[PDB]
Every structure is written in structure tokens, then in C-alpha cells.
Write a protein that binds this ligand. Structure first.
Ligand SMILES: CC(=O)N[C@@H]1[C@@H](O)[C@H](O)[C@@H](CO)O[C@H]1O
Ligand SMILES: *[C@@H]1O[C@H](CO)[C@@H](O)[C@H](O)[C@H]1NC(C)=O
Ligand SMILES: *[C@@H]1O[C@H](CO)[C@@H](O)[C@H](O)[C@H]1NC(C)=O
Lengths: 48, 49, 265, 208, 49
């Protein structure tokens, strides 16, 4: 006549705190260039 | 089958040294500066690099 | 037992609350033991030649971390050995020194858990060619009159155990308050209190002495180990000695109070 | 070292008790070449290791009060009539349903019930003092509430690890190509790719 | 030729004079203590075996 109720669920393991894998969506790639220019035995920097 | 003899390294401390060749088979020699030998007793000798 | 760092003498009357103030900020401890043994070596150059020119933080490196070059342009130009922390060498290499690179560089090592730091300065003067390139000592640093358009190496190597990853027993801050009573010898003194950075506390003597002899509640959160001795009894005299130890960092401090008690007539 | 199961045993001087569980343990190591144990000389790389220190700052384990517990020694049925003998100096509750859900409390006492069947009444040594971790082998008190938490020690951390430097290959000469005399004593991973439009990715594991 | 038969050759088994090349290259020390790391090709005789 008795009865028993059983339930189960899931959660991320503690070690996940360092083993996580994250999914990303990327778009509109942008590019940055560092140029070094030399003129009249003088050196100049830039990054644009 | 052969056997690689590895005599303990020469150490010249806080000065300079130069490599020297020998007549032994496959003899290979090489110096290294800036080394810092350490051993169970501690630092073997003393001059920074 | 801890080596001599501070020794002092105190005198008070019986029935009064004594305060033997032992403190060591280097005994401060971090509750976070997650690789707390992080070391960061970074190079900071100030171009004093260019008038008041903002100093450039050329490069960072973290033990168990990358050698991040701060500015994209300097990538490749600035180099530090990859085994720097393994061997203790933290010297810098500038692949092609130019007039823009001239200035006083300064290597700085920082140890987070010990909250310690060190640093040394090296100058880099840029001369046009080899007819005036050399090295000398100014009085507080080594100065390199560097060959413009060629690689130049700025030396600094910290040969100490604090900056190496060899096992150190992972020690943490610990403290021992002893009381060498009159006629007793030091390092045999009856232990009065024992403390650890983890909050472990041990008391000695009769319960009344434990109530009277007591160290502050949050010692290691403040780097404080002051010993209160409430309602002094003349038997509470002697050489109180607080041994503070941190073997992972090398702390072996001794802080002593010669508390001689007196009584009325 | 690896195996197929994990076993924990304790010897009580005269008796020994062990409990085990299946688990696929296989030796693994970091780098592009699977060695046995790290050598004295080699490069330094990032790894993740469990700190050997009690202090932890990762994980969160629950804890709540225990459920009831049954026992047979609390009731005796040598005679036709029931008999309950709760442990001396210990409170006990007893329950059975004959006629109604009759329950009683006994403090070092042997109370009686009208119904006679041995199976009928059951006894709890209820204390509800110490909390317990949830497990399939326990039962839940009717409240079903979370009471406290605890830290799981010995948690992960990133740290430097040593890895071997494999024997450097010998490059050869070949018109519009190369031949590599690759020498290695343990499994190693070789990879390459062209620098043009086509990736032409190539990867291989070399044993000897 | 390293990694092949006849890497070590001696006019007689107990000849003091030996001629052999087996591609031994030293490596710079990079550890606290004293230690000479040598990297070498697998013995030719064993691979022929
Ligand atoms: C620490 C030591 O003994 N020698 C090093 C050397 O290997 C390195 O090349 C130089 C900077 O490049 O700093 C110094
Ligand atoms: C650059 O070249 C010019 C052309 O003669 C010269 O006058 C000048 O001194 C040079 N600058 C440097 C820094 O050498
Ligand atoms: C059982 O619990 C009741 C309720 O407080 C108490 O009065 C009694 O003394 C307890 N009996 C024993 C044996 O502890």
C-alpha cells in the first residue's frame, strides 16, 4: 500500500569552474596594424 | 650497442673558460655561460652569471 | 624558534593590564590560497630624455602566465626569457634600440601572497654608432650607451628562492608566544599561545592565565599579535617572545618584551 | 596508477571492510607527446592540478537534517502480544496502523499497543541533531528543507608543469619538397600546414 | 650514419681507437641544480636488431 516518489535533476560539476567550454558567435572582423616608418635617418612608430 | 659516457661537467666559477676537443669517439664539447649550479649543499659557487 | 628581529623591555605593576604589542604586516595572510604564489615581473621605462615623457610599461610576465607585450608595435621588439621565473633571470632585450627607446628602464618583481616586491633600474642611452657605445655605472644603476639599430640587453637577475618555484613546503604564517619566566632559558620558555593563519589557536597555563594572557581575535587579518595580560600577577614577569614564521617566504622574525612586574608595599 | 575501479578499505584489527566503485582511470599527460613521467629538463606549460592544501574556494555541497530510521531490536514478539524495549536511556517513537495511525513516545519505557502482529508497529530513535548529506540510501524528513552548506576541499588550480623536449629532427634536401628523418622513442604528435590559401592541414602520431 | 647499423665501428672489440658519429647535441642547462642534458639518436644496432 506504500508508495515512493523519486526525482532527479542535473547541475554542472564543481570542476567546471575551470573546465568550461563557451560558445561564441563572431562577426565583422576588424584588423589593426603596427607600422614602423623611417625617414631621414629618423624612426617613428604608429599603430592604427 | 653503445653507452653514452657523461663525465660530470667542468665548472669554472665567476670567470671564463673555453672548449677543447679530444680524441674520444663522437666527442662533443660545449661551454655555457650564465649558468647557476645548485646542489644539495646549496649554491656551489658565486658570481651573478 | 625565530631569529632576532626586535627586542624590547617593559615594566608594569601587578593588577594592571599589560600590552606586549607584537605585530608584523608581513604576517598578513590571504584567505585565498588559489595559486596565491603568483609572481609578476614587469618592465617600466621612463624616457627622461624626452623632457617629461610619459613612462612606457613595455612588458608584463606572470609566473604560470604569458609574456604579454603591452603595445602591439613593441611585439618582437621587447623580449624577456621564457624561463625567467624558472631560472630567476628577468633581463630585457630590445631587438633594435632607437632614439625612441632611450630612457631609464626599471624591472619590477612583485609577489602577491607575501605582498613583497623588488626592483632595479638600468639606463639605456642611444648613441648613433659604435664609436660611443659602452656600459658604465652611474652610482645607483648600470647605464648602457647602446648601439642604435642593433639589439641591446638590459640585465637584471634576481637570484633568490622567493622568485623560484622549487617546492617550499607551502608554509603559511604561524606565531608562537612563549614566556621565559625568571630563571628559565629562551627557546625552553613555557609556551603561552600558538596561532596560525588558518585561525588555529592554542592556549597554555591555567584557565585564568588563558583569560588574562590572550592575543587579539583577528591577528592574521591585521598582521597583529599583540598580547594582552590582564590583571598582571608578579609571576607573569619574564621575557615574552613572539616567534613569527612563514617558511614559504622565509619570515623568521622574533619580537620580544622583557616584562618585569612589580608590586606595591 | 590507473586501473578499472577505485577501492577504499579499513581494517578494524580483527575485521576488514572495503567498498569499491567502477571507474575508468587512464594515465594522461599534457603536451604533444604522451610520456610516462615528466623529465628533469624541458619546457614549462600550463596545467591544472588539485592543490594539496585543506583550504578551498570552489564547490558548494548541501546538507540537511536526517530522516527517520527503523529497527527490529526495538520490538520483540516472542509472545503473542507485542513487546517494545527501546534502548536504555534513550527516547523512542513507535507507530502502527491497526485501527488507526496510533503513535507513542517512550523514554526508557516499554509501552504497549492493542494490535499484536509483529510486522505492525515500527520504532524510530529520532534525534534530528546532526545534519547529513543527501544520498540515495537515505530518507528525507517530511520538512524537506536545506539547512547548511560545506566546502569541498582540494579544488583545481592552474600551475606550471614540465614537459619534455623531443629530439630535434634532421632536415634534408629535396626540390620543391622536404624529407624529415623523424626520431622519437615515445608517441609524439607532428603537425604542419601550408601558408597559402589552402590550409592543407596535416597531423599525425609517430611512435618510433 | 646515425640510427642505422654500423654506427659504432672499432677495428677490434678491445681497440682503444674508435670512430663513430651518432648525432649527440648538448642542451643548455635550464634547471636550478647541476645537470647536463644530452639528446641523441636511437642506437643503430638496436634498430637493425
Ligand atoms: C641569468 C644568466 O646567467 N644569464 C642571462 C642570459 O642567459 C640572458 O641571455 C641575458 C638576457 O638576454 O640575461 C642574463
Ligand atoms: C640624417 O642625414 C642627414 C643628411 O646628411 C644628416 O645631416 C643628419 O645628421 C642625419 N641624422 C642623423 C641622426 O644621423
Ligand atoms: C524524551 O523527550 C521528552 C520531551 O522533552 C523528555 O521530557 C524526556 O525526558 C525524554 N526522555 C529521555 C529518556 O531523554
Amino acid at each position: 500500500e506504500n508508495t515512493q516518489l523519486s526525482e532527479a535533476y542535473v547541475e554542472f560539476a564543481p570542476d567546471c569552474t575551470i573546465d568550461h567550454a563557451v560558445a561564441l558567435k563572431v562577426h565583422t572582423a576588424a584588423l589593426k596594424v603596427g607600422l614602423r616608418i623611417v625617414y631621414g635617418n629618423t624612426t617613428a612608430r604608429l599603430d592604427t | 650497442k653503445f653507452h653514452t659516457v657523461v663525465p660530470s661537467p667542468q665548472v669554472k666559477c665567476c670567470g671564463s673558460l673555453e672548449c677543447k676537443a679530444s680524441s674520444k669517439a663522437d666527442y662533443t664539447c660545449r661551454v655555457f655561460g650564465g649558468v647557476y649550479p645548485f646542489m644539495w649543499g646549496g649554491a656551489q659557487c658565486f658570481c651573478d652569471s | 624558534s625565530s631569529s632576532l628581529v626586535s627586542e624590547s623591555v617593559v615594566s608594569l605593576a601587578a593588577g594592571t593590564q599589560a600590552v606586549l604589542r607584537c605585530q608584523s604586516p608581513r604576517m598578513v595572510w590571504t584567505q585565498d590560497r588559489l595559486n596565491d604564489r603568483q609572481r609578476v615581473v614587469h618592465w617600466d621605462v621612463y624616457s627622461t630624455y624626452y623632457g617629461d615623457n610619459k613612462m612606457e610599461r613595455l612588458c608584463d610576465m606572470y609566473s604560470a602566465g604569458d609574456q604579454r607585450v603591452y603595445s602591439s608595435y613593441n611585439q618582437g621588439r621587447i623580449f624577456m626569457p621564457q624561463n625567467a621565473f624558472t631560472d630567476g633571470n628577468f633581463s630585457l632585450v630590445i631587438k633594435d634600440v632607437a632614439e625612441s627607446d632611450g630612457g631609464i628602464y626599471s624591472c619590477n618583481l612583485h609577489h602577491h601572497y607575501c605582498h613583497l616586491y623588488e626592483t632595479v633600474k638600468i639606463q639605456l642611452d642611444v648613441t648613433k654608432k659604435a664609436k660611443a657605445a659602452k656600459e658604465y655605472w652611474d652610482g645607483e644603476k648600470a647605464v648602457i650607451v647602446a648601439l642604435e639599430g642593433s639589439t641591446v640587453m638590459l640585465p637584471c637577475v634576481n637570484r633568490n628562492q622567493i622568485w623560484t618555484e622549487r617546492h617550499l613546503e607551502e608554509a603559511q604564517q604561524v606565531v608562537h608566544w612563549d614566556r621565559q619566566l625568571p630563571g628559565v632559558s629562551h627557546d625552553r620558555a613555557d609556551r603561552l599561545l600558538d596561532l596560525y593563519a588558518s585561525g588555529e589557536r592554542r592556549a597554555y597555563g591555567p584557565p585564568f592565565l588563558r583569560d588574562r594572557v590572550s592575543v587579539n581575535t583577528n591577528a592574521f587579518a591585521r598582521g597583529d599579535f599583540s598580547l594582552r595580560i590582564d590583571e598582571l600577577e608578579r609571576a607573569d614577569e619574564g621575557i615574552y617572545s613572539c616567534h613569527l614564521h612563514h617558511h614559504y617566504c622565509g619570515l623568521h622574525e622574533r619580537r620580544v618584551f622583557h616584562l618585569q612586574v612589580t608590586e606595591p608595599a | 596508477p590507473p586501473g578499472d575501479s577505485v577501492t577504499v578499505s579499513i581494517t578494524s584489527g580483527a575485521s576488514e571492510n572495503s567498498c569499491t566503485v567502477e571507474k575508468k582511470i587512464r594515465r594522461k599527460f599534457v603536451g604533444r607527446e604522451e610520456y610516462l613521467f615528466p623529465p628533469v629538463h624541458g619546457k614549462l606549460v600550463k596545467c591544472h592540478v588539485y592543490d594539496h592544501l585543506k583550504e578551498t574556494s570552489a564547490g558548494y555541497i548541501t546538507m540537511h537534517r536526517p530522516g527517520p530510521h527503523a529497527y527490529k531490536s526495538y520490538l520483540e514478539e516472542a509472545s503473542g502480544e507485542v513487546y517494545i524495549k527501546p534502548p536504555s536511556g534513550k527516547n523512542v517513537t513507535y507507530e502502527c496502523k491497526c485501527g488507526d495511525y496510533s503513535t507513542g513516545i517512550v523514554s526508557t519505557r516499554t509501552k504497549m499497543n492493542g494490535c499484536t502482529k509483529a510486522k505492525q508497529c515500527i520504532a524510530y530513535k529520532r534525534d534530528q541533531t546532526k545534519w547529513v548529506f543527501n544520498s540515495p540510501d537515505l530518507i528525507r524528513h517530511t520538512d524537506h528543507s536545506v539547512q547548511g552548506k560545506l566546502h569541498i576541499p582540494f579544488r583545481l588550480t592552474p600551475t606550471v608543469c614540465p614537459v619534455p623536449l623531443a629530439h630535434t629532427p634532421t632536415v634534408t634536401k629535396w626540390f620543391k619538397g622536404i624529407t624529415l628523418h623523424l626520431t622519437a622513442t615515445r608517441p609524439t604528435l607532428l603537425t604542419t600546414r601550408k601558408l597559402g590559401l589552402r590550409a592543407d592541414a596535416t597531423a599525425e602520431w609517430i611512435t618510433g | 650514419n646515425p640510427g642505422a647499423f654500423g654506427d659504432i665501428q672499432a677495428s677490434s672489440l678491445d681497440a682503444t681507437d674508435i670512430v663513430a658519429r651518432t648525432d649527440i647535441r648538448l642542451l643548455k642547462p635550464s634547471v636550478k641544480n647541476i645537470h647536463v642534458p644530452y639528446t641523441q639518436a636511437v642506437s643503430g644496432y638496436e634498430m637493425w636488431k
